């Protein structure tokens with residue numbers, strides 16, 4: 083996906099301020115709460131009975147951390163997302179059989195979490211740049227389907 | 229997209245029996261009838277007030293013929309759909325701004341039209357092969373978005 | 375919303391299905407499993423091969439639910455309430471999958487009922503299956 | 516379906532919006548136009564640049580409709596019937612676009628109401644906007 087220099091600037095500047103220990107868990111937790119069918123893939127994580135249970139779950143926080151790591155890795159290789167996400171694509175598509183619509187949903191939940199954390203700093207043009215990114219990541223993760 | 233030889237065989241054998249003067253118009257007409265918001269892009273085609281009006285419209289039949297032509301062209305280049313649909317992608321994405329979900333819808337309407345025309349010959353494995361094809365075409369047509 | 379003509383079209387088309395109801399449901403499932411392999415994971419206790427008695431039996435169940443919806447088309451949320459709880463809560467079926475099965479049901483009807491599958495009736499059946507899908511995805515918690 | 520807690524959450528969150536209602540609606544539209552440029556084609560008679568009086572005015576209209584839906588949350592099909600006719604018949608808005616505007620409304624609320632945008636309230640607001648979208652796409656003909 084192609085970002086303008088202005089968009090690359092906006093994206094990288096904000097990402098440097100991201101709490102990498104927390105934001106991924108917040109996004110994954112909110113995915114599980116807002117789109118409850120996604121809990122089907124996380125039965126081994128234990129207590130997901132309430133939103134508080136989900137957000138406080140140590141396994142949700144720990145996994146979210148790896149997801150964010152993957153998004154961080156994507157931001158470093160915006161012109162080769164397919165190669166970057168190849169192994170993850172095989173995992174999520176060939177092994178897990180997650181419907182790729184959910185890749186889009188998690189990306190949009192991440193965008194909501196960024197808006198929550200950054201407030202007015204998450205301007206409409208900054209959001210538009212991040213939407214290009216999470217669409218790119220979703221499409222790359224879905225490559226094994228198409 | 230990758231079809232097995234058995235799937236390629238099923239696809240090419242059926243496609244040779246397709247009425248290339250009619251099937252495209254039937255698919256485009258049904259898209260306009262079943263998903264009426266798509267009529268937004270065809271105001272110049274005239275009478276679209278009833279299903280009979282749509283299916284009998286000479287402009288719908290004529291355009292459908294070109295669409296099918298594009299699908300036929302895709303079937304000949306299953307391992308290079310991106311290049312095959314590059315100009316069409318620029319038209320539909322950059323100029324027309326059609327949401328790419330509608331590429332999927334038209335592909336699925338075509339599959340329904342093939343089922344209608346071929347009956348029990350359109351077996352579940354034949355359908356599964358055609359679903360790979362129309363997904364490939366939709367993804368290639370949407371390339372300018374991602 | 376389903377129009378008076380939609381309800382008439384759906385009742386008429388589904389009336390032609392007859393004793394083939396269960397058979398068509400089983401075929402729609404098979405089409406879905408082959409075309410959209412992600413959907414197979416919901417049925418690990420099923421053998422999903424052709425001629426599977428489990429897919430046959432399940433197709434009948436699916437068809438009986440659609441027939442219930444047709445028979446109670448003005449009261450579908452109530453008629454399908456138990457099935458909504460099942461699919462959304464217990465089974466956690468991804469809402470995308472209802473679009474996939476709906477498409478395979480249309481393909482099945484098109485392949486078996488060429489006279490009935492007019493453009494108008496195709497449109498009515500699509501609206502009906504979308505309405506059914508809306509009810510079955512209405513209970514996510 | 517919206518639960519009692521959902522309705523409570525939505526009424527509470529929307530209550531915090533206040534005199535900023537029109538402003539937030541305008542911002543959600545701007546976010547949608549910039550993020551999802553396909554949506555711009557519905558507004559050729561609009562200048563869609565930042566600070567556009569037309570986008571500002573329209574945002575208020577959108578917000579007033581959402582406020583109507585909140586105030587009549589148990590009777591939304593009736594309350595939004597005229598707006599459903601408009602968007603589906605006259606304007607022929609693609610149903611995908613309602614998901615896009617709904618997401619931009621959530622982002623706008625998250626960016627302005629950090630205390631209110633809890634995971635539970637996020638879930639309730641998503642269900643509410645999906646319900647609104649379901650009504651506004653219910654009249655395609």
Ligand code: HEM
Nearest residue numbers: 120123124148149152153174180184185188189219220223
């Ligand atoms: C942009 C979207 C996504 C990204 C970047 C992502 C990234 C990741 C990463 C980095 C891992 C760890 C893999 C490893 O341990 O080597 C993982 C595992 C996993 N993902 Fe995701 N993921 C995404 C979407 C999803 C969604 C939507 C679901 C389900 C609804 C899902 C289900 C899972 C599961 C169940 C695992 C554990 C697999 C295992 O441990 O065997 N993922 N994902």
Ligand code: HEM
Nearest residue numbers: 266269270294295298299320326330331334335365366369
């Ligand atoms: C797989 C999906 C599709 C294929 C293969 C396809 C193919 C084509 C082809 C071959 C043309 C003729 C271009 C030319 O004259 O050189 C065309 C034009 C057009 N298409 Fe499609 N199309 C698809 C989907 C759609 C959809 C879903 C819409 C709208 C809902 C749409 C709207 C249009 C319009 C308005 C034109 C006329 C453009 C012009 O004459 O300037 N297309 N398409």
Ligand code: HEM
Nearest residue numbers: 413416417435436439440457461465467471472475506507
């Ligand atoms: C038109 C849409 C659908 C209808 C009418 C329908 C109907 C039914 C019925 C009648 C049952 C049996 C209920 C019972 O025995 O208590 C059932 C069970 C089930 N459905 Fe569906 N269904 C639909 C869509 C789906 C989809 C899209 C999926 C997943 C891709 C799905 C997955 C399942 C599963 C896994 C079961 C349980 C099977 C078992 O454990 O024996 N359904 N459905």
Ligand code: HEM
Nearest residue numbers: 554557558576577580581598602606608612613616647648
């Ligand atoms: C939550 C979803 C939405 C709400 C509450 C909403 C509300 C409204 C309202 C209140 C009006 C003015 C009605 C009037 O003046 O009679 C309107 C008009 C309009 N809407 Fe929406 N709308 C929604 C979604 C959308 C979407 C997704 C699109 C397209 C992407 C769209 C395109 C339009 C257009 C083109 C107009 C007419 C503008 C004009 O010609 O002045 N709407 N909407």
